[PDB]
């Protein structure tokens, strides 16, 4: 219900609607880094190179298997509540815990059949499982067909510097592990990672949500070196009768200074609730936004009572900064205070004043040029434009507060004594 | 650990021969054999190499018409040649090459040959 | 791959010390193998990764080197030790031997 021709009286403009975007559900998919790569009929080229990888690989993945084993543990009918503390938030992800504990079974499958082979992505299903090799795409192309014309030295050495080269790579940000890194490394993109899946489906704005998704890691060999990680890709669905605005004030004028009304970036209406929305952590797009979690977050009463018409209500405060704008045009025409910066009709020399009762002064085909300092516009001919005691005074520092309290407890002491 | 060769004799020129090295002691599905060659009062040269697998490599003089294959079940290895010419009168030697490593149960091992 | 050897004569007596060097065109490694190769005779194995002893064969043969540069030597003569000795190298799938060094 919110009203946005009566607010402009005050300074107050919204801009266009937009609609929301949530993902109530996930799709879990599981994916196998093998990092040593296999050679075939090579002769045994490749050691004393794989060894030596080895030993740089050691200093990661000892460290991580470490850890993974001084993790407490939420939960152990989905299992047993266990000792300590938990919220929420940490429930939500025991169960996705013991869901990949309770499918250890057909994943040790899997690995068996990889064992032995030489093919960069391998999937099945029964859960499907994705699983790609270290560097295998290179050495088969490049490494292995290196062989015959080169000898076994130069290819030792290649392989050597690509090898050092992807242990660089990783510990960039395997020291959540981020979808990004994972794409980056054997560059791929998403797409096609996951070739059976919704990703099909998705826009430009939403594969930069999935690319925000933290990915965790819930198993480390240490004997054939492999980690697996747990996705989470997410089913988007259009919310419905909810909207989503913008917030915008400019400067208002009483008795020759100068005010605002306070708001929020942001504002939006679901059904018959009225609040302001945070967007910080969501995604904007052409058409809707992408949220993780409903934003929305309780607004003081007086500002729900101001947004939906009751114009008397709104709060005021007193401007500090030149970051409060004094101009600006909507439709057809501006919107300005006037008195501070000088407005102008057709002629340059032509001025037009607003009284010192009125706040802003809104022009319509009113005036066909108008000028604002020293530039002057042609008011578009198509626009939908047409041509008060505020009573709330608010300040937002904790200084001002604490005098007003002091002149309040002094007044109060005079009265009864 | 002992390889045998057999084939191989006098042949006038144009004409086709199979020689055959026969193997046994040690494993077979583990290692590549190639063939050599010297000529009398000549030093040696190689003639080709099959890995296990058939990948199949040639040398300029004899590429293009003979054909080395082997069987792994029956532990035998052979060359075919074709077209022969004056200058491939020399005895033939299958030998083993080496791992690209230094493992304690590396040993090599050659035939006696064929006089061809 | 080009593999040289020098000397390619060689005169010597009972009991002296020999030393005998191959050198490639590019690095080849630690891949080299010694042969002795008597007239009418299949050749045999001495040293088959520059440095590493054949079973059986007598301790008067040792050799050392790597990369381009490679050595053999033998600490007592024979009667027996006449022979050609070669170096092969075993880098690339396609080998090549060298040329070739009577000892006399």
């Known amino acids: 219900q919110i009203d946005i021709t009566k607010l402009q009286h005050v300074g107050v403009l919204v801009n266009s609607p937009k609609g929301m975007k949530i993902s109530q559900n996930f799709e879990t998919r599981y994916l196998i880094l093998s990092l040593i790569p296999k050679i075939e009929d090579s002769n045994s080229c490749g050691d004393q190179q794989i060894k030596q990888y080895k030993r740089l690989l050691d200093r990661l993945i000892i460290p991580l298997y470490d850890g993974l084993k001084l993790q407490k543990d939420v939960i152990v009918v989905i299992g047993t509540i266990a000792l300590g503390v938990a919220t929420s938030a940490q429930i939500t992800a025991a169960v996705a815990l013991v869901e990949a504990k309770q499918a250890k079974s057909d994943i040790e499958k899997l690995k068996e059949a990889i064992r032995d082979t030489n093919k960069a992505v391998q999937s099945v299903c029964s859960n499907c499982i994705v699983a790609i090799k270290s560097v295998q795409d290179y050495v088969n192309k490049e490494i292995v067909p290196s062989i015959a014309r080169l000898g076994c030295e130069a290819a030792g050495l290649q392989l050597g510097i690509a090898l050092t080269q992807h242990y660089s790579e990783l510990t960039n940000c395997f020291g959540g592990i981020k979808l990004q890194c994972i794409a980056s490394l054997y560059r791929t993109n998403i797409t096609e990672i996951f070739t059976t899946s919704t990703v099909d489906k998705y826009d430009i704005y939403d594969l930069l949500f999935t690319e925000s998704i933290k990915v965790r890691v819930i198993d480390v060999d240490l004997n054939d070196y492999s980690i697996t990680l747990q996705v989470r890709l997410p089913l988007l669905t259009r919310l419905l009768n909810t909207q989503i605005y913008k917030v915008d004030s400019i400067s208002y004028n009483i008795q020759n200074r100068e005010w605002y009304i306070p708001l929020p970036s942001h504002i939006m209406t679901k059904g018959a609730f009225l609040g302001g929305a945070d967007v910080k952590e969501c995604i904007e797009a052409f058409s809707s936004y992408i949220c993780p979690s409903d934003p929305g977050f309780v607004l003081n009463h007086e500002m729900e009572s101001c947004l939906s018409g009751n114009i008397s209500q709104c709060p005021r405060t007193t401007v500090t900064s030149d970051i409060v704008p004094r101009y600006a045009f909507v439709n057809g025409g501006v919107v300005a205070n006037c008195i501070t910066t000088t407005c102008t009709c057709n002629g340059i020399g032509n001025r037009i004043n607003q009284p010192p009762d009125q706040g802003v002064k809104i022009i319509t085909k009113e005036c066909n040029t108008i000028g604002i300092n020293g530039m002057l516009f042609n008011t578009n001919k198509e626009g939908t434009l047409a041509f008060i005691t505020l009573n709330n005074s608010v300040a937002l520092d904790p200084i001002d507060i604490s005098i007003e309290l002091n002149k309040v407890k002094s007044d109060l002491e005079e009265s009864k004594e | 650990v002992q390889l045998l060769e057999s084939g191989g004799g006098l042949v006038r020129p144009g004409g086709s021969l199979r020689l055959s090295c026969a193997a046994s002691?040690?494993?077979?599905?583990?290692?590549?054999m190639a063939w050599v060659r010297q000529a009398p009062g000549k030093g040696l040269e190689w003639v080709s190499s099959?890995?296990?697998?058939?990948?199949?490599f040639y040398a300029d003089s004899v590429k293009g018409r003979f054909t080395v294959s082997r069987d792994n079940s029956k532990y035998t290895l052979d060359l075919e040649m074709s077209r022969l010419r004056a200058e491939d009168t020399a005895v033939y030697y299958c030998?083993?090459?080496?791992?690209?490593?230094?493992?304690?149960?590396?040993?090599?091992?050659w035939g006696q040959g064929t006089l061809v | 791959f080009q593999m040289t050897q020098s000397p390619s004569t060689l005169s010597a007596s009972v009991g002296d010390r020999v030393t005998i060097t191959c050198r490639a065109s590019?690095?080849?490694?630690?891949?080299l193998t010694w042969y002795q190769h008597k007239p009418g005779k299949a050749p045999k194995i001495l040293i088959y990764?520059?440095?590493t002893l054949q079973s059986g064969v007598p301790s008067r043969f040792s050799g050392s080197g790597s990369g381009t540069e490679f050595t053999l030597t033998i600490s007592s003569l024979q009667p027996d030790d006449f022979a050609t000795y070669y170096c092969?190298?075993?880098?690339?799938?396609?080998?090549?031997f060298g040329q070739g060094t009577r000892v006399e």
């Open positions: 590019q690095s080849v490694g630690n891949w």
């Open positions: 030998a083993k090459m080496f791992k690209w490593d230094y493992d304690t149960s590396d040993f090599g091992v």
């Open positions: 092969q190298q075993f880098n690339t799938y396609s080998w090549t």
């Open positions: 990764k520059a440095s």
């Open positions: 002691g040690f494993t077979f599905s583990k290692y590549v």
């Open positions: 099959i890995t296990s697998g058939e990948r199949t």
